[PDB]
What does this fold into?
Amino acid sequence: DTHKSEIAHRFNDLGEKHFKGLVLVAFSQYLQQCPFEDHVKLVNEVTEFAKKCAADESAENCDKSLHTLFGDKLCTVATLRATYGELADCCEKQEPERNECFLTHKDDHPNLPKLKPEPDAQCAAFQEDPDKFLGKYLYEVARRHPYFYGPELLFHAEEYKADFTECCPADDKLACLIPKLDALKERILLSSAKERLKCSSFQNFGERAVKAWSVARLSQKFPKADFAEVSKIVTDLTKVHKECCHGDLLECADDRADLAKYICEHQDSISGKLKACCDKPLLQKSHCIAEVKEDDLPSDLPALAADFAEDKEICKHYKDAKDVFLGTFLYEYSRRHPDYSVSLLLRIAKTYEATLEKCCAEADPPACYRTVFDQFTPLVEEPKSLVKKNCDLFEEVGEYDFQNALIVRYTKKAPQVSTPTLVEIGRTLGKVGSRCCKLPESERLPCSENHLALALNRLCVLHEKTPVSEKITKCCTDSLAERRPCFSALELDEGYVPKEFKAETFTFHADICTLPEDEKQIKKQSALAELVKHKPKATKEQLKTVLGNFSAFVAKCCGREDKEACFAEEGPKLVASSQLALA
It folds into this structure.
């Protein structure tokens, strides 16, 4: 078989730490609400069985697929029906039905307590049992991010470990640690969103979309890599993420390490950016490769016209070599467009395709498609200008205000979406501005739009469980490449029924005062979303004014000796008048 004992195989390939680590992740992700130590128990159990199997691969049940095994193990959890009404059902199922059911049950918004950099308790529990602590952390993250890129989560566990290692004996324990952990969780959220997108793309669009994505993306990254090489990496990487996305984390990690190895063996024909990565220890390397910056364009990028616009037998290649020719196009076009977002590239590929599909059905395809690259211009311009308008706004207005505009913007598009989601999305989209907008300008488009894809996908993912808007559905389930334009193209449904006004929603209390700023913002942005839901027609500018008024009022009442009296005295008036200020 593919390996006598997949479990042994993986155990042997990954080694215990990573294997347990990934099993922990795998398990945490599948069974998100389970006590950490029950996951540890299961991981141990499975790891134990790994070890037995590694010792005797012909042992009873060592033959079983990883999933049967892990599904089996998960299905043994105590409170299975209790904790996971859904999952129990899954457990009656054989693989892969069972895994599929299990994945489906994966909760993308388990809304678990926020992992708070709690330096003392954490440093303590890390100093007590760094293994349990990192485990916990894998668990905490995995369960919060049921699709987090397993291997990556082990890598992040290292950073998490490295953070605590650096910061625990420091006198300045909080201020060594909180920013690291803050950054880590951000890196986590982003990585998570990245992997979520990958996984969503598999789920929702299939491997070919993931592939085309990865082609576009790895072409950008590895522009000096030949197509074959990109393709190879894409196939492998797709497999990696397919596995990971399917909770086949061991395979995923193992394949990933294979891939990293492969990439590092081939770094010279892949990218000079890999050298840094390929010098790194395993997880770092893989991480580094995953996150690798795009290589310099090779100075021998081929003119694309010749093959892709001018070549007379394009239709022929298009007909008998579609995937490849398009893949090639995508590769070629993407490697020379690190300045475009992947989805843009994919849209461009789709237009390229559509244009061949058009041109080749016509009388002189060549005269039709010779202008094929020219049809990319509008595809380019739209996101470029959206990125500009957004960076401009962002620049002008700053993250929170930008988030607010985004919250308004998305709440308008999708007012049925839960406030927290809307806030989350607009918040994340604002973090996109902050991330992307400050980048060298040619990086903002790919940045914004790539990151936008992450956040939309987040919304989409959320929308999967909690479908509230067909328009979201449509945007989420139509072309992944079009998803961002689709969302961008959303505006307010002049159908949507303003959410009934509930004063309390905008009623602030002094509790807000003790909130960290991001939570006060969230509270404001939540009210803001709510202001929008209630007054969908209210312009962002009215909303901004009103939120302004709310913020001021909050700021003021928080600064009052009697915070609550302030909120109590002044809130309702503002709540009432706010409404006047809207639609």
